[PDB]
Amino acid sequence: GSHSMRYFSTSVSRPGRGEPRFIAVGYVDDTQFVRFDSDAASQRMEPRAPWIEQEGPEYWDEETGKVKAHSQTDRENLRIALRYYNQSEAGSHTLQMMFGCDVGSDGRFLRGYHQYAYDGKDYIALKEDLRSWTAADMAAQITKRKWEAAHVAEQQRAYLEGTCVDGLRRYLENGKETLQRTDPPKTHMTHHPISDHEATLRCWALGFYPAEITLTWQRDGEDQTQDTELVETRPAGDGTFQKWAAVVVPSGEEQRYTCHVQHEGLPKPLTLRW
């Protein structure tokens, strides 16, 4: 349907242990394709996807040039920030960055993203209009004011629309097998007593792609979100995904409950009943 490609960069200082550590990973949708690591011995962009291993070495070279360029950018980004906020070098601080782009079912551009976060909170980030910056605190205004005056927002918008998209366009051909497939969940219920007057009802979804999904419990058709347990969606590690939600019920009123699953690989959503 719609599609996405994002690049995620984590850098971390280790004050005693030398240089900061830089980790970056490619993703199309919920499929990962490449990775790069400051501490790896390869020092190249390595493929994480079978359909991306086919690219020429002049592809790999140029990509690993640009990621290496980012890495030192962020290492100096970490120095600037310790300076800006006046934290002591003894502390270990973290700088996360993401950028990428979204396309419609025909493949035209939809949205685009360029953003950084310092110590798990937002530092700077590009607005949806792609003409301005949102800057949380008085530090990021300085970087805003650097990047406004230096015309950064113009140059990234040209990347995001021109480049970011065209690659996602080829990747989705290249990976037609995996990338564009969609997998319905295999679903079922399990029943796990606790006391003699109570039982636990768990509704499962297994082996689905993409990972966006909605699990729902109800009684008599009325919605039960109150007493419901629901776990975070977990990668099955084969490339598919897994999730479950569960409720506690008075025994024996169980068939009075319905579990409702919605996923993009489902022509019509389902209903499970015990």
Partner: protein, 100 residues
């Protein structure tokens, strides 16, 4: 320097069949900072050949790692996942249930 206690999930790849070669996944998410130690146990003793996925995060800037190893459970063998993190006064241990 905000802090986030990790969410730990331990599970088989495919629903278990005793004497069938599954994988064992321990999946941690939603945590901050990113330094995290994770082990996979058989009966309480750590497993050596363990690979992990590559460090990433979700839109809320919370990290997620997947630690995985191939295995073949028995009716006897107990398995579990040990995670230590800055947010945990001791390492927390999670025993793998065939129903979770």
């Amino acid at each position: 320097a905000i802090q986030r206690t990790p969410k730990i999930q331990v599970y088989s790849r495919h629903p278990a069949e005793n004497g069938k070669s599954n994988f064992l996944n321990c999946y941690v998410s939603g945590f901050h900072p990113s330094d995290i130690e994770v082990d996979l146990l058989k009966n309480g003793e750590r497993i050596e050949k363990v690979e992990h996925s590559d460090l990433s995060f979700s839109k809320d800037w919370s990290f997620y790692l997947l630690y995985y190893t191939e295995f073949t459970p028995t009716e006897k063998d107990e398995y579990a996942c040990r995670v230590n993190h800055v947010t945990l006064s001791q390492p927390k241990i999670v025993k793998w249930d065939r129903d979770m």
